[PDB]
Ligand binder design. Structure first.
Ligand code: HEM
Length: 181
C-alpha cells in the first residue's frame, strides 16, 4: 500500500546491510512527507538518489547497483503480479508482451498512461529485438529486469545493447538472444 518499487527494494538492501541502512539514508534523503506511494508518481526521483547513495555505502558502482536492483525488482514484482506475468508461461511470450499486457494492466491498477516506450519484436533463430526509449534513460534498469525474469525460469540469455539514448542516440536497441544449448 506504499511504493511498490520501494517495497521490493527495501527487501534487497535489508539482505545486503540490513534495515538500519535503509531507514538511515531514507530519512536523510526523504522529503517532508516521508512516504513512498505506488499509486502516485511524485518524489519518484528519490529512487535515483537512493540508488547512487546506497551504492556508495555498499561500495558498488551505480551502474551495477541499478542493474542488480532490476533483476530483483522483477522477482518481487512477479510475486505481486504473478497473475499478469504467468500469462507468458515462458520468457519468449513475455518479452513480446511487455508493453502490451504487462504495462497495460499496471496502468489501470496504478499510475497513468505514461509508461516508458517498449516495443518487442520477434526475430528468427530464437532472437528477440526489444526497443527502448524514455527520458528516464534508466535503460540500465530494463536490462536487469530482463535477466531477473530469465533466471526466475532457469532460462539463460544474452543482451546486446549497441544503441543507447545515453550515447546521444534518440532511442535504444536491445537484442535478446535465446540459448538453445
Ligand atoms: C522484463 C520485463 C519488464 C520490462 C523490460 C519492463 C521495463 C520497464 C522499465 C525499464 C521501467 C522503469 C522506468 C524506466 O523505463 O526508466 C518500467 C516501468 C514500470 N513497469 Fe515495467 N517492465 C517489465 C515488467 C513489468 C511488470 C511485470 C510489471 C508489472 C508488475 C511492470 C510494472 C511497471 C511499473 C509499475 C512501472 C512504472 C514505474 C513508475 O512510473 O512509477 N513492468 N518497466
Amino acid at each position: 500500500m506504499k511504493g511498490i518499487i520501494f517495497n521490493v527494494l527495501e527487501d534487497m538492501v535489508v539482505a545486503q546491510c540490513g534495515m538500519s541502512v535503509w531507514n538511515e539514508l531514507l530519512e536523510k534523503h526523504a522529503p517532508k512527507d516521508r512516504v513512498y506511494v505506488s499509486a502516485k508518481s511524485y518524489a519518484e526521483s528519490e529512487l535515483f538518489s537512493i540508488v547512487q547513495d546506497v551504492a556508495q555505502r555498499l561500495n558498488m558502482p551505480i551502474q551495477d547497483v541499478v542493474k542488480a536492483f532490476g533483476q530483483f525488482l522483477f522477482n518481487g514484482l512477479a510475486s505481486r503480479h504473478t497473475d499478469v506475468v504467468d500469462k507468458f508461461d515462458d520468457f519468449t511470450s513475455l518479452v513480446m508482451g511487455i508493453h502490451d499486457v504487462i504495462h497495460l494492466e499496471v496502468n489501470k491498477l496504478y499510475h497513468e498512461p505514461s509508461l516508458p516506450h517498449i516495443n518487442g519484436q520477434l526475430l528468427p533463430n530464437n532472437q528477440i529485438a526489444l526497443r527502448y526509449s524514455s527520458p528516464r534513460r534508466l535503460c540500465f534498469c530494463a536490462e536487469g529486469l530482463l535477466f531477473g525474469a530469465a533466471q526466475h525460469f532457469q532460462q539463460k540469455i544474452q543482451i546486446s545493447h549497441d544503441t543507447c539514448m545515453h550515447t546521444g542516440a534518440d532511442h535504444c536497441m536491445l537484442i535478446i538472444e535465446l540459448q538453445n544449448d
